[PDB]
Each structure stands twice: as C-alpha cells, then as structure tokens.
Amino acid sequence: VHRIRITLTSRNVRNLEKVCSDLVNRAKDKQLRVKGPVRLPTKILKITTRKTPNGEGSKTWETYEMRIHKRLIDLHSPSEIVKQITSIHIEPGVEVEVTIA
C-alpha cells in the first residue's frame, strides 16, 4: 500500500556505495521484502573545447568528461522507520529524494 522509493544519485562511487550498503543493511535488519540495490546506466556528458586562449597555435582540442551514477531503492518501511533511516543516512555529496505517490 505504501511503497517508498528513494534515489541514490551521486558521482563518488565510494560514498554512494556506502550509502547504498547502509540502507540495504538496515533493510535486512528489519525485513521489508529485502529489496536489494538496482543499478542504472551511467549518464556521461562529453564536452570538447580548445586549450589556447588565443587563435595562434596548432589545432588542439581537449575533451572533458562528466559522468553521474544513479541507483533506485524500493522499501516497504513504515513512516517512522523511513524518517529514521533518512536521519541516519546524512552523508556529504549524496543527493536523495523519496517519492510517495
């Protein structure tokens, strides 16, 4: 009736994995259909620019990369447990969002 979907979008692999491990461990501490992590395709943004501030010089083009990683988690937790786990899952560099309905 009340399914909680939370986002696990970030760029730091280590910290997003740590957040994902923490919530999965809590979801295994209290049985909530033990739904595990789900991995989404990486959204990588490729931009190519020049290096020379002026126009003089050889044709050199620098390509930069910007990739983000998304994960989704579905839980059957009650409101009190949901607010508790979100309180303990405060980490830097991790953006989370919960959709109710």
Partner 1 sequence: ENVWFSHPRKYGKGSRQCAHTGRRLGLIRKYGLNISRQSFREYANDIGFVKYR
Partner 2 sequence: FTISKKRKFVADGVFYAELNEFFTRELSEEGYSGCEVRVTPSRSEIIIRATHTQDVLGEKGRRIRELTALVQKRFKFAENTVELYAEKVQNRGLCAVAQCESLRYKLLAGLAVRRAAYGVLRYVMEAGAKGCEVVISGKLRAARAKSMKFADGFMIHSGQPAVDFIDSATRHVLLRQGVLGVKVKIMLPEPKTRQKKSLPDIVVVLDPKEEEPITK
Partner RNA sequence: UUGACUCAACACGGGGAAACUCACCAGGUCCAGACAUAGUAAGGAUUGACAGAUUGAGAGCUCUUUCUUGAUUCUAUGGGUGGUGGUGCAUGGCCGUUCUUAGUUGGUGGAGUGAUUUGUCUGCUUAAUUGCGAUAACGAACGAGACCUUAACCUGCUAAAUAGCUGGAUCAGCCAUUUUGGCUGAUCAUUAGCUUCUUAGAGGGACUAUUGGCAUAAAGCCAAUGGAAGUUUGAGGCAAUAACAGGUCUGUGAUGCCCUUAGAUGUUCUGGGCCGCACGCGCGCUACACUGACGGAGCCAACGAGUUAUCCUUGGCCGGAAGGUCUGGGUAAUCUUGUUAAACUCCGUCGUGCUGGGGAUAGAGCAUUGCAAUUAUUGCUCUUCAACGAGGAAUUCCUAGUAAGCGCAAGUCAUCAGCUUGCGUUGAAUACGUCCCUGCCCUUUGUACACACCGCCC
- Which residues are at the interface with partner 2 (CB under 8 A)? 9, 11, 14, 43, 45, 66, 68, 70, 90, 92-93, 95
Angle CA(13)–CA(17)–CA(21) in degrees, nearest 5? 175
| Among RNA, partner 2, partner 1, none, partner that 90 touches (CB below 5 to 8 angstroms by kind) | partner 2
Kindly report the three-state secondary structure assignment for every residue of 11-38: CCHHHHHHHHHHHHHHHHHCCCCCCCCE
CB of 45 to partner 2, least distance (A): 6
CB of 63 to partner 1, least distance (A): 7
| Among partner 1, partner 2, RNA, none, partner that 42 touches (CB below 5 to 8 angstroms by kind) | RNA
The rounded distance, in Å, linking the Cα atoms of 29 and 31 is 6
Comparison of 46 and 101: residue with beta carbon closer to partner 1: 46
The rounded distance, in Å, linking the Cα atoms of 69 and 83 is 24
